[PDB]
Each structure stands twice: as C-alpha cells, then as structure tokens.
Amino acid sequence: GEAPNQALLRILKETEFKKIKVLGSGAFGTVYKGLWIPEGEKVKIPVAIKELREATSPKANKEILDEAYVMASVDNPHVCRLLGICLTSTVQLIMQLMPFGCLLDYVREHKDNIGSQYLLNWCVQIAKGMNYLEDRRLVHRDLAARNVLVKTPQHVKITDFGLAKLLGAEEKEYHAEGGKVPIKWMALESILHRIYTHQSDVWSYGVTVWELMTFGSKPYDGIPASEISSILEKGERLPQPPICTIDVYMIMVKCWMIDADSRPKFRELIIEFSKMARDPQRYLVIQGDERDVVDADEY
C-alpha cells in the first residue's frame, strides 16, 4: 500500500570513466576521484568512484548493491544522488563529487572567513536532508562533517551511505552485528547494544554541528575510543564552542542525551535552526561577521 519507486539505476562501462586520484581506502575497498564521460556525449563530469576489495564476498557484494539502491532512490536537494553503477567484477559506485570536498575540510580552511548566517544555514540544510531520510525510513549511521559534501557555500549535501540501513514497516530500530564504526560519532546506545535508530542519528548530527561550530576541531581529541562509552555514562560531553550562545549549545546538549526519546527530532531541528538563521548574530559570536566539462546535474 505504498508508491512505486521508479528510481533509475544507470549502468556504466568501465570505459566511460577514469580514476584521477585516490581519496580514501578501508576494509570496504577504495574511493577514487576521476571523471565520467557519458556514452557519446562530449562532456566530462567530475565524480567519485567507490570500488570494492574483492568480488567474492557475498556479504560486501550485497551491501554494496544495497547502498546503491538507497543512494539511487533518494531525491533531495541536500542528499547526494548516485550517478551510476559499474557491475564490473569488483562492483563500483559512481556518485556526485562536490567541487568543494567535504564540509569538514572546508571549515578547516575558510575558518577565518566563515560567518554565522552560513554555519546556521548548513545546520538547517543538513537537518532538512536528514529529515528527508527519516521519511524514507533510512538510518544514515554515518553522519559527520567528513561526510557532508559542499556543492557551494550556500548549499551542502549529505553522502556516504556505507552503513546506511532501511527500516521495516513496523521496525523502529536496527540491530548491527560487528564491523568498524565511528565511535566518537555514535549514540551511547549504539555502543552498549549496537542499536541504531533515527534518534541515534540525531546524536551524530549533534556531534556534526559541534565540528562545524568548532571549525573542524576533532571530538574527544586523543581520548581513545576504548572508553568513550564510560566517559559518556559519566555525564561528560563535548565542551561549548566559544562562538556558540547557550541557545545553540543547548540544542547540541539535547542531542547527546541518554534517553533517545528526549533528544530533538530532525523535524524540529529544522525549525529551531531556521529561526536562528534569520538572526544569526543573535546566536553566534563570530567577530568580523558582517565583514569540456559539466557539473553533475544535467539529467
């Protein structure tokens, strides 16, 4: 009793796209840069390519196709879309590559030029995007400043659905079974019970905001992951960013509550920030404030 998906999954030939440089690598495989040159069309399109490690792992080969499915079905202005998929022996994913890298790497550069009206807008956008996902019953499981592409300083998008997971008509949570996870970004509940919910993503959002407000600082710096859980159970959290009014930090604090039902909801996170974004100066203290080829969107 739902709507038909109709999302298009385009298949690409290993010859339609080249790899320029590697961007990251892990137990999954590797993510290269390179550009795509559609069949026939005389236009180069910079994209990101995620290739696997081995084409013999029924587990990874299944998850990879899952990630494809979800990134191919999402249709939001603040969520990256999959461009195509290459069913080569080691399945490759071809997605959008924002011309400004990730929001994390952005703020660590323009930190001395980043105003408030901007930071608050990014908060709005990310939330808008996540809320969209909540509607699709999706759980990013991997929100972080590192996983937020920058299409333009006035427009950012979410990506990386490696860990992402879909929910069952009745299912309200998802239980995971082992596999590397970013501890310093996940809810206490996802550590003590490996449980992941929409409210768990809210937690990650918090942490993500902190990064932005800190201009890319590293959370729980040094403090190794093999204790966070204990730190958290001790009521300890990330400190209040100097530039942040109690008004803002509070939203963050509410994000990192033990009771998942006491944390804010992406629906309301959008209103809350939206409000603030109208009077940024009254929420952020950032002295000096007032001071061949295509894009990827060409159906």
Where residue 84 sits, what CATH number does that domain have? Answer: 3.30.200.20
Query: What CATH number did the domain enclosing 109 receive?
Result: 1.10.510.10
Question: Gaps after which residues in the chain, C–N over 2.5 Å?
Answer: 291
Q: Are 52 and 91 in contact (CB under 8 A)?
A: yes
Q: Are residues 222 and 134 in the same domain?
A: yes
Sign (positive or negative) of CA dihedral 107, 108, 110, 116: positive
Tell me whether residue 299 is in a domain. no
Q: How many residues does the chain have?
A: 299
Tell me whether residue 213 is in a domain. yes
Tell me whether residue 51 is in a domain. yes
User: CB 242: neighbour CB atoms within 10 A?
Assistant: 9
User: CB 216: neighbour CB atoms within 10 A?
Assistant: 18
Q: Are 149 and 156 in contact (CB under 8 A)?
A: yes
Residues 6+ apart with CB under 8 A from 86: 11, 12, 13, 14, 17, 92, 93, 94
Q: Are residues 200 and 157 in the same domain?
A: yes
Q: Are residues 112 and 77 in the same domain?
A: no
Q: Are residues 144 and 24 in the same domain?
A: no
Q: What are phi and psi of 39, to 5 degrees?
A: -60, 125
Burial code (b: 16+ CB inside 10 Å, e: under 16) for 124-139 equals bbbbbbbbbbbeeebb
HSE-CB for 18 with a 13 A CA cutoff = 3
- Alpha-carbon Rg of the chain, whole angstroms? 19
Q: Which domain holds residue 106?
A: 98-293
Q: What is the resolution of this structure in A?
A: 3.1
Tell me whether residue 157 is in a domain. yes
What angle do the packed helices 266-278 and 246-255 form, to 10 degrees?
A: 170
First CA to last CA across the chain, in angstroms? 29
Q: Are 43 and 296 in contact (CB under 8 A)?
A: no
Tell me whether residue 196 is in a domain. yes
Structure tokens given for 261: 């039902």
> Could you give the CA distance from residue 284 to residue 120 in angstroms, rounded to a whole number?
9
Q: Are residues 240 and 119 in the same domain?
A: yes
Q: Are residues 120 and 219 in the same domain?
A: yes
- CA distances to 45, 201, 219, 264, 269 from 206, in Å: 34, 9, 11, 10, 10
Residues 6+ apart with CB under 8 A from 55: 61, 89, 90, 91
Tell me whether residue 232 is in a domain. yes
Tell me whether residue 3 is in a domain. yes
Q: Long-range contacts of range 196-200, CB-CB < 8 Å, 24 or more positions apart?
A: 196/139, 196/141, 196/165, 197/139, 197/172, 197/173, 197/260, 198/134, 198/139, 198/265, 198/266, 199/260, 199/261, 199/263, 199/265, 200/139, 200/141, 200/260
Tell me whether residue 49 is in a domain. yes
Active-site residue identified among 75, 105, 135, 142: 142
HSE-CB for 267 with a 13 A CA cutoff = 2
Sign (positive or negative) of CA dihedral 116, 117, 118, 120: positive
Q: Are 153 and 147 in contact (CB under 8 A)?
A: no
Q: Which amino acid is at 279?
A: D
Q: Are residues 212 and 246 in the same domain?
A: yes
Boundary (domain end) residue, out of 52, 79, 97 = 97
Boundary (domain end) residue, out of 47, 62, 97 = 97
Residue identified by tokens 């009745």 is 170
Q: Are residues 275 and 191 in the same domain?
A: yes
Q: Are residues 89 and 140 in the same domain?
A: no
> Could you give the CA distance from residue 223 to residue 220 in angstroms, rounded to a whole number?
5
- Number of domains comprising the chain: 2
Residue 22's beta-bridge partner residues?
32
Q: Which amino acid is at 289?
A: D
Boundary (domain end) residue, out of 69, 97, 125 = 97
Q: Are residues 79 and 184 in the same domain?
A: no
Q: Are residues 151 and 62 in the same domain?
A: no
- Angle CA(222)–CA(228)–CA(234) in degrees, nearest 5? 120
For the question of residue 142 being annotated catalytic, the response is: yes
> Per residue, what are the HEC states of 158-198?
ECCCCCCEECCCCCCCEECCCCCCCHHHCCHHHHHCCEECH
> Per residue, what are the HEC states of the chain?
CCCCCCCCCCECCCCCECCCCEEEECCCEEEECCEECCCCCCCCEEEEEEEECCCCCCCHHHHHHHHHHHHHHCCCCCECCEEEEECCCCCEEEEECCCCCEHHHHHHHHCCCCCHHHHHHHHHHHHHHHHHHHHCCEECCCCCHHHEEEEECCEEEECCCCCCEECCCCCCCEECCCCCCCHHHCCHHHHHCCEECHHHHHHHHHHHHHHHHCCCCCCCCCCCCCCHHHHHHCCCCCCCCCCECHHHHHHHHHHCCCCHHHCCCHHHHHHHHHHHHHCHHHCECCCCCCCCCCCCCCC
- CA distances to 29, 292, 297 from 85, in Å: 15, 23, 17
Q: Are residues 123 and 53 in the same domain?
A: no
